[PDB]
Subunit: 173 residues, 10 copies
Amino acid sequence: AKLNHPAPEFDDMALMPNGTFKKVSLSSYKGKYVVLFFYPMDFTFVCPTEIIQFSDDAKRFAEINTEVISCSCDSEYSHLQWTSVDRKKGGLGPMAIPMLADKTKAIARAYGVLDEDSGVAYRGVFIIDPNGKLRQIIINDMPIGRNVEEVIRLVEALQFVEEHGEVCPANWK
Amino acid sequence: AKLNHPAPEFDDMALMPNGTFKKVSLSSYKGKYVVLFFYPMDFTFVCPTEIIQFSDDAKRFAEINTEVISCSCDSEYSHLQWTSVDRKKGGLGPMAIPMLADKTKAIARAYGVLDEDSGVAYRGVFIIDPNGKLRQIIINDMPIGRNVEEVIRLVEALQFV
Amino acid sequence: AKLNHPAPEFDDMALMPNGTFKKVSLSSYKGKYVVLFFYPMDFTFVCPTEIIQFSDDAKRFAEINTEVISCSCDSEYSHLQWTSVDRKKGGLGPMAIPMLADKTKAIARAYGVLDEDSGVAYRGVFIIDPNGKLRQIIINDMPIGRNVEEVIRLVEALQFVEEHG
Amino acid sequence: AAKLNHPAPEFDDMALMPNGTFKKVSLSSYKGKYVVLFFYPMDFTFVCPTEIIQFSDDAKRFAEINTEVISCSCDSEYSHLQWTSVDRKKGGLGPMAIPMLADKTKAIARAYGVLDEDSGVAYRGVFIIDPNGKLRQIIINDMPIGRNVEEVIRLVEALQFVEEHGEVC
Amino acid sequence: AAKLNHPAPEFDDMALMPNGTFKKVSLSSYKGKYVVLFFYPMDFTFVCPTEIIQFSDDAKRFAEINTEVISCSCDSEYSHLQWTSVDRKKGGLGPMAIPMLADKTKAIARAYGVLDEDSGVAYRGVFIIDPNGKLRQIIINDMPIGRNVEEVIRLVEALQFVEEHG
Amino acid sequence: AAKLNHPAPEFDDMALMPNGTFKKVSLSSYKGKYVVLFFYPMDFTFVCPTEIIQFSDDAKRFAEINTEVISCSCDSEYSHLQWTSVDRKKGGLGPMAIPMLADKTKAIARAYGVLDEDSGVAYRGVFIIDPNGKLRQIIINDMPIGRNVEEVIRLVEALQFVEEHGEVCP
Amino acid sequence: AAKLNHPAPEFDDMALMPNGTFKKVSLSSYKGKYVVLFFYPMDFTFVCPTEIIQFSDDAKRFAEINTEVISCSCDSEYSHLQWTSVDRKKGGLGPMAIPMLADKTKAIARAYGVLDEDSGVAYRGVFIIDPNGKLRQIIINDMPIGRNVEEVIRLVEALQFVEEHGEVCP
Amino acid sequence: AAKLNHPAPEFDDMALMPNGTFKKVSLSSYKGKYVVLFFYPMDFTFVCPTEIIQFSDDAKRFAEINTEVISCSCDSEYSHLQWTSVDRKKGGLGPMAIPMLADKTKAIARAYGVLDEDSGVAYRGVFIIDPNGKLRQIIINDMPIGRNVEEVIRLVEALQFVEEHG
Amino acid sequence: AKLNHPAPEFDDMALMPNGTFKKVSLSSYKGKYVVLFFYPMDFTFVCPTEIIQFSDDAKRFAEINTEVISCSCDSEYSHLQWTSVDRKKGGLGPMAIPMLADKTKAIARAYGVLDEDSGVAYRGVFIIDPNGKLRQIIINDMPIGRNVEEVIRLVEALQFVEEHGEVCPAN
Amino acid sequence: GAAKLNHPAPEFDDMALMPNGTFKKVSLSSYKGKYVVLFFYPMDFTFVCPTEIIQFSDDAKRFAEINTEVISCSCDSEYSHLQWTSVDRKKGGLGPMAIPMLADKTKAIARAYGVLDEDSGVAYRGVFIIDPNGKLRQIIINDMPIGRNVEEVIRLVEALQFVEEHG
Ligand SMILES: [Cl-]
Ligand SMILES: [Cl-]
Ligand SMILES: [Cl-]
Ligand SMILES: [Cl-]
Ligand SMILES: [Cl-]
Ligand SMILES: [Cl-]
Ligand SMILES: [Cl-]
Ligand SMILES: [Cl-]
Ligand SMILES: [Cl-]
Ligand SMILES: [Cl-]
C-alpha cells in the first residue's frame, strides 16, 4: 500500500444502498475518486456518527465526482441487521454507501489497517484517484473519530492540483 | 487436533449467559466434560434452530457433568445483538450457553473447522473430557443440522467407559 | 481430507459380500452416496456389533442410493477368516458390505483416522456424495460405538438439500 | 516500520534547535509529552514552508496542551540553518520555535515508511506519539497536498480526552 | 536394512506368547541366547502355515542348542490368537511353542529390510542373532518359496562351532 | 540397495573365463537363463576354496536346470588366474567351469550390499536372478560360515516350479 | 563498483545548470569529452567554497582542453540553487560555470565508493572519465583536505598525451 | 574494502631494505609516523623507474616531515635486488633509500584494491596512512600515468596541518 | 597430499619380509626417511623387475637411514601367494620390503595415485622425511618403469640439504 | 589442482619470453603434435638454481631430436625473465635460452598443475610430460631445494614413446 502506486484491489461482498448483496471491486470505480474507510466492528456500543456522517455527506461527495464505501471484518448479513435497526435506537438505518464485508480480512491486511491481535480494523481512510492510484493515507486509533469535512478538503485539494498545475499550502482555501 | 491428545486451548471473548463480556478459556472447564460446537455466521438467513437446541438442553447437559459452549467468527457485539432479539421473530433470545467469538479465527483453525475460502466455520462439534483431552470429532457440512441428542449419547457413552 | 473437496481416492483389496477378493476404488461409486467407516482391528474382544449394524442396515441404505463399505488395517485374508466364524460365537458371519483392507495404511492416513502410535484406525465415518466430494466427518474414540441411524439421518439430510434449496 | 499502539520508531539525529544550536535529538528525550513528528520533502522549496511554518507558529498553542512538535527532512542541519536565516518575508523560513531534524542518513524517513525510495525525499507524513512513547496516529499526504495543523491538534486533544476518561483505581 | 556383525535392530512389540497371554517382547530380553527371528507375509494364508509350524515344532530341538525362535508379521496380536485357536487339522495353526510378534507399526519389518512397501507385508526373512546381540546371518526368501528349518539349525550350530574352537 | 522382484543390479566387469581367457561379463548376457551370483572375501584364503569349488563342480548339474553360475570377489582378474593355476591338491583352486568376476572397483559388492566397507572385501553372499533379469533370492552368510550349494539348487528348482504351476514350500 | 579502465558508473540525476535551470544530467551525455566528476560533503558550510569554486573558475581552462567538469553532493537541487544565489563575497557560492549534480538518492556516491555510510555524505572524491566513457583516475581526499585543481589538469593533459603518442613519466 | 578513516589494511611481507638485507616489514612497525605506500606494476620496465626513484630521492625530504615511504609490487624480493644492482644510468634503479615490498602473494595489492586481477599486477596506487594507522588518502593512477610526488607531500603536510591546529 | 606437509598417515596390513602379517603405520617410521611406492596389480604378466629392484636396493637404502615399502590394492594373501613363487619363474620371491595391502583403497586415494576408473594405483613414489613430512612426489604412468637410483639420488639430495644449509642443485 | 593422468593436461595460455628476445603468448594447444615438457621453478634471480633451468635449455637440442619441446614457467614477469636472460651466464646470469619462458603473473598455471605454494606465492620444482595428443602422462614435484635430473626426464619421454611405438 504505497502512495502514487495503484491502490490495493479489493473485490468482495457489500451491502448495497438499497438492500441487495453485490460483490464490489475497486476497478468498478475506475473513473471516479474513491473514499475507502474502515471501522472495527458493527454493533458498536456508541454513536455510529462516524460511519453515518459519511453516508450523509455521500450526496455532497458525489457532487464532487467521488464515491465513498465502508468496510469492516463483519458479515454482509451482520451489516444489514444493523441497517435494519432505526438510527434513532442506536441503529444505523439505510445508508447511501455500499458496505464492504471482508470476512476474509484480505482487505484490511492489504491496506495495513488490520490489528492482527484483535482481528479488526483501525479507523483507516484512503483516497484513491480516478486512475486507481492511492493518494492519501490516514489511520486513526480505535477511539478517535475522523473529520469527514477534512476528507473532502483533501479530495477537493487533490482535484485542484489535477485541474491546475500548482500545489496547496497549509490549511487550504 | 488429535484424539486422546489435549484439546486445542482456546481463550477468547464470550457473551456470557446473562449479558456480560467475559474472556473464557478451555482450562477453566478443567474438571467437567465440555461440548464445543461451531456455526458459520450469526444473523443467518433462515437458520437459527440448532444453536438454540443446545442452549435448551444446556440444563439436561449440566445434569451430566457437561458444560457446552458455542463459537463462530462473529464479534462479541454482533452476536449479543442476537441474545436480546426475540426468538419469536427469527431472533435468538437469552442463551444459557456462553458464546465464543474468535474475531481472530485462531480457534476455528485450531480445530480445523475453518473454511479458509469463506472465512467462517463448518458445523463442528467436539467433546473434551474432564482431563482436557479431545475425545470426539464431528464436522457437518454447512447446510446439515446436528442431532443434539446424539452428542449426549456420546457423552454418556464416554462416561460409561 | 477437507469438506466440499473431492474425497481422498482409495483403491485397495476388499472382501466382497459373497467371498471374492476384489480391488475396490472410490471412483467405482461415482454416482451414489458412499459411507466409509473405519474400525481398529478385526478379531478383538468386543467390536462386532458396530460393524454388523452397518452390514444389516446395508439394505436400508441401498434403498436411499447409498452404498457402505468398511475398512481397517487388517489383511483381506484376516477379514475372510472373521467372516467365516458364525456371528453367534463372537464371529462376524456373511456381510452385505465390502470390507476394505489397507495393509498399507495409506487410506487411514488419507482420512486422518490413523493412530500412528498403535498402527490402527479410530472409529471414523465419512459420507461422500455422488459427485465424489466429502460432506461429513465423524471420528469416535476407540471405545465409543457409533449410531448408524444417525449416519442415515445425515445422508437423508444431505439429499434433502440436494433436491430443495 | 511502524505499527499503531506499538512503541514508535526511535529517532536520534541532528536537529537545528529553535535558537541556533546544533543538538542531537532523540524520541526518548520526549518521554513524558505527546510528540508530533512531521515530514517534508526538501528545504528551499518554493512552497513547502507555509505548512512547515504553521506548525512553528501553533507551536505555542501545542505546548499549551502538553505536546511538543518537531520537523524532519532529508536535508542537512546546515541547509536547515541557511533556510532559517532567510527572512520569512522573502520566501524564507525565519526563526522556528520547532527543532528541525535532519536525517542525512534517511534512517528516519524509512523507519516511518514515509520515504520515496525513488526520489530520496519524504512524503508529507505526520505522526502523533503519546507520552508513553507509542505511535497513535498515522497521516501521509501526497507531495502537493498541504496538511491542516488544526486537525493534528483536534487529534491530539481527542487522544488526551480518551486518556482522561476510563482509567485506574 | 541391517548390517552383519553389528548389533541387530532392537525390536520391542506385542507378541502372542506360547500359552495364550499377550506380552510385549524385546530382543534385549534374549541377551544371552541365540535368537532366530523369521518373518511371514500374512496370517490366515492358503497353503503356507507349514513353514511357520515347522519352526514351532523344531522349537524344542532349537532350545536344546541354546537358541530361542520367534515369528513376526504385520498382523494384529488378536489376529495371531484367532489363528492359533483354529485346529492345525483344519488349515489352522494350533498352539505354538513360539512367541508370535505382531508389529502393526511395521517398524520391525522395515528395521530388517524385509518389508515390501508396495504391499505392506514382509518377505520370508530369517535372521540369526548371537548371544551378544549381534546379527550374524541374513536370509530372505521370495513370497512363494518356503524355507528349510534344518538349514537354519545347521547355520546356528555352525556359528557356535566357530565361537567354541576358533 | 536394490531389492526383490526388481531387476537385479547390472554388473559388467572382467572375469576369468572357464578356459583361461579374460572376458568382460555382464548380467544382461545371461538374459534368458537363471543366474547364481555368489561372493567370497579374498582369493588365496587358507580355507575359502571348498565352497568356491563346490559351485564349480555342481556347475554341470546347474547347467542341466537352465541356470548358469558365476563367482565374484574384490581380487584382480590376474589374481584369479594365479589361484586357478595352482593344483587343487596343494590348496589351490584348479580349473573352474565357472567364470570368475573381479571387481577391483568394488562397484558390484556395493550394488548387492555385500561389501564390508571397513575391510574392503565381500561377505558370503548368494543371489539368484531369474531369466527375466529380476532378483529373486537373497542370502548373506557371515565370513566364516560356508554355504550349502544343494540348497541354492533347491531354491532354483523351487522357483522354476512356481513358474510352471501354482506354488511350493518344502 | 568502480574499476579503472572499466566504463565509469553511469550517473543520471538532477543538476543545477550553470544558468539557473534544473536539468537531469547523465554521464552518457558527455560521451566524447573528458569528464571530471568531483564530490563534496555538504552545501552550506562554515568553510570556504574555495575548492568547489576553483573548479568553476578553471572551468574555462578545462573546456579549453576538451574536458567538462561537474560537481556532486547529497544535497537537493534546490539547496544548490539557494547556495548559488548568495554572493561569493558573503560566504556564498555565486554563479557557477559547472553543472551541480544532486543525488538525494545517494546512488551516485555509492557507485563511486565515496559515500560515508555512517554520516550520509561524500568524501572529497575526484574521478576522470575519458571520452570513451571509461574511468581513468581515482582520487579520494579526506573530509578536511582540499584538492589541487591544477593537478587534476596535469592528469588530464597527461592522459591525453598518452592518447596521441605512447607513454609518460612524472 | 579499504575505507578512509578506518585502520589501513595491515601488510606484512618481505621487503628489500635500503642497504641490501631482506627483512619482513609490517605496517604496524610504522605505528607512530605517517606512511606513504605506493604501488607499481612490474620491475624491469624500460621506462617508469623515474617515478619509483623520485620517491626514493625525496625520501630524505619526506623523513624530514615525520613520514616514511615504501614501495610495493608483485615481484620477488630477489627481482627487486637484481634491479637495484643495475646502475641508474643504464636504465637501472640503483640503491634506494626506500624499503621495497614484494607481495608474491598479491595479498597486499588486493587489500588496497589496486590489483588488476586480469593481468596480475598493480596500478599506480598511492595511499597515506597517518601515525595512528588510519588510511587518509587514496590515489590510483592508470598504468601509463606517472604520479606527482610533490603533491603527495602537499597532502601529507596538508594532513598534518589539520592535526596540529584544529 | 601436499609437500612440506605431514604425509598422509597410512595404517594397514602388510606382508612383512619374513612371512608374518603385520599392520604397519607410517608413524612407526617416525625417525627414518621412508620411500612409499605403488604398483597396479600383483600377478601381472610383465616382469616384477621394478618392485624387485626396490627390494634389492633395500640394503643400500637402509645404509642411508631410509626404509622402503610397497603398496597396491591387492590382498595381503595375494602378496603372500606372489611371494612364494620363485623369482625365476615370473614370481617375486622373498622381499626385504614390507608389502602394504589396502583392500580399502584408502591409501591410494590419500596419495592421489588411485585411478578411480580401474581401481588400481599408478606407479607412484613418495619420499617422507624423518619428521614425517612429504618431500617428493613422483607419479609414472602405468607402463613406465621407475629408476630406483634416482629415488636414492633424491634421498641423498634431501639429506645433503639437512647436514649443510646449502642446496643440492641440478645433480 | 586437478591435473589427472591420462586426462588432457591443463591448458595454459600466457606470455613467454621466446628464445630470441620476443614476447609471445604461448599456449599448450600450440604444441598439439609433439611431446611437451613443462617445468616450474620458484623465483627468477634466485641466489642459485638456474643451473637446473639451464640444463634444460641446453638439452633442448637433444630433446628436439626426439620430438619433444620443453618450456619453463614461474610466477615472474616476462620482463623479469628478459632481464635475467641479459646477464651473462658466467656472472650468475642465465644467458640466451633455447627454451620459451612462461610467465604467469596470474598464477593461473601453477594452480592448474597444483604446483603453487599458496603460502609463499611461488611454484615448486614441478615437471610434467604432455604427450602429442595433449594428455598428461607424467607427474614430478621436487621440493624447493632439490634439483631435478634432466636425463631422467628424457628417459621417461623415450620410455613413453617406446610404449607408444610398441604395445
Ligand atoms: Cl509511502
Ligand atoms: Cl485423529
Ligand atoms: Cl474442513
Ligand atoms: Cl497498524
Ligand atoms: Cl552386510
Ligand atoms: Cl526387499
Ligand atoms: Cl582498480
Ligand atoms: Cl571510502
Ligand atoms: Cl604441492
Ligand atoms: Cl592421477
